[model samples]
Target: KNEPVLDTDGDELRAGEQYYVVSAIWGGGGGGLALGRLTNQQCPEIVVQRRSDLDNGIPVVFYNLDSNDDTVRVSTDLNVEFVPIRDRLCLTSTVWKVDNYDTSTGKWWVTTDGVIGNPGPHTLQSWFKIESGNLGYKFNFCPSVCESCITLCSDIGRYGNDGQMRLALAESGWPFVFKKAS
Candidate 1:
């Protein structure tokens, strides 16, 4: 349960490294998913979904406060953030942050509004985990980063709405494999 998470090449995933979070499932217009704002939304909230043309997805960097070792381990609290792979608008930071649960939308959408570097009031919202699963690795939104703060625990899964399949904190998780960027 404490083993290091591996990449698509079977190498251990290390912290502070960049990797593409590609879907493990085959076909269906989803392969290399990336973070971007929905065209329909006026806000710059980053949503994880597929872009029509694909070569590789956006490169994301991982960080953890629980371990000194650079190797990323399963179930450990991690800060999953994306590096700017292309020119974007209204984006200040790309750290994955859980947005306020909108009952109207029936989803707790993941956005790129988290603080970088250290843990703070947004600690619960920013921390995520890579869990070992059948289809490879999946992200979980349960944070152990702050012991004093109340948190919500759920697997990060996809839900299609308004024609976009977006990754959100849901009952199930969307499994994915990491491809190290060269």
Candidate 2:
């Protein structure tokens, strides 16, 4: 069933499980978003992370079709943090919540905590489908020209793409369908 298969307790994704997160739908095109590891060589990729915890969100990382960062955590705004939204989780730039005595600069800044903060309504949630279906997520992350924005970016760790996977952003909608990795 390539539909939403959720844990009754909510997005209680199993620990240490890996998922082939994809864009599924977007203006650029799904599957195409896989992260371009190897420093923009050969091919690109999608993200694969070992489940950490919902509160801290899944501590997943991005890699290429070939291989895989340590901390030092690239700019908070650039960092993607997933905190649980009810049962499922919402994607946001929670990474941008720090300070600056040294003076760090960014585009604008999007996604503030959760809906309660900016109501940015920027965060998106997911629904895993059983039998290796596509996980759908909402919010395109189009926060342009604002430090207080969570602009969705990048495509990491993807496997042999047959082109059957991608979908245009106009069509991707909320919960982009990411095929379950095998």
Candidate 3:
């Protein structure tokens, strides 16, 4: 497991404060059971914090349901810590899913199944602004899945551009802008 880095800045992240978040792959294991049929299980929960000191910052949470678990358990609550990296904040989490089968190469590739595309070296950066007494964040990810290909046969399948998605977080209904830094 990869250890999480914490930010010790004394400045308290407050409502209405603008922040940027970038997340990348931390670590994972390989050699799991071969892919048979896709299933649904409980998706991991994601929580956001204002500071590394989990006790000091506000928490924003979200979850993605597992499609493999028979229980059809959906991630309802997530607790994640938001750490500061220079001028930007970071959120770290592992993706739970199986890999795709490569009949030709006789190997498997870690597949995101259209979730956030493949994987990083993928980074998500967004500007977050507080609103309605809550911190709101918005970010965009390109629909390209090739960047996440790990093994040689990982690039077999493709999803349409519509697969591209955006995320926005707020206490109440609020509006935020999504754009590429460039």
Candidate 4:
């Protein structure tokens, strides 16, 4: 992934930039799968919250992978807040199955809030996982308005070799910058 060069002209890139990755899934005949480039953007802030640990502050940085210049910037600051979801009635679950011979009898499950979703016991499946982490301060690209704010959430099971946490933007559903804060 090449970084984009910063333009002194201030032509900022918006959300929905697309890129492609080779799909691990293969057809019955063993042909390569063309997974479309995942869309991504540079978000302002990222927030992660869970109930048990509120004071353990974590620092994070955002990177622009598409930039050709390789220059990184601190987009915004965020703080982890603990919000217990114990009372939320909406629950979801995902299941995966791992089988080398037939790919018909493997199992993995994730229960969200407690509703059964993605019932699977298929074949060997892999997931990208990121352990619990945090970013410090509020994301504020436009200081005057609150409604035009941007927020981010980490892709719970995925990470890149660069040590930056891969995340999805809450407003646009795109992948964005991630780097450890200095």
Name the top lDDT candidate.
Answer: 1
Query: What lDDT does each candidate get?
Result: 0.79, 0.27, 0.22, 0.21
Candidate 2 local lDDT, 1-182, one digit each (tens): 12332332334233223333444334443331221122322221222221221211123222111111221111111223332223423233322221111123222112123221222234221111112225444323233224464544422222222222221223333243333233
TM-score of 2: 0.24
Candidate whose TM-score is highest: 1
Q: Which prediction has more favorable lDDT, 3 or 4?
A: 3
TM-score of 1: 0.88
Best first by TM-score, ranked: 1, 2, 3, 4
Off by over 4 Å in 1: 39-42, 51-53
Locate the minimum summed-lDDT window of 10 residues in model 4.
Answer: 29-38
TM-score of each: 0.88, 0.24, 0.18, 0.16
| Candidate 3 lDDT over residue span 1-182, tens digit each | 11111212323322223222322111221111111112232223222212121122222211212222212011111112222223322122332122334464443322222232222333121111121112222221221233454422111111111121112221232222111111
Better of 2 and 4 by lDDT: 2
Residue-wise C-alpha lDDT for candidate 1, range 139-175, written one tens digit per residue? 9998876778878899999887667677898887988
Judged by whole-model lDDT over C-alpha atoms, candidate 1 comes out at 0.79
Q: What's the ranking of the predictions by lDDT, best on top?
A: 1, 2, 3, 4
lDDT of 4 by residue, 1-182 (tens): 22231212333222122111111122221111111111241221222221122222232212232323234323321111112223322232111111122133221111112111121221112111112123211122111112243322222222221232222212222122222122
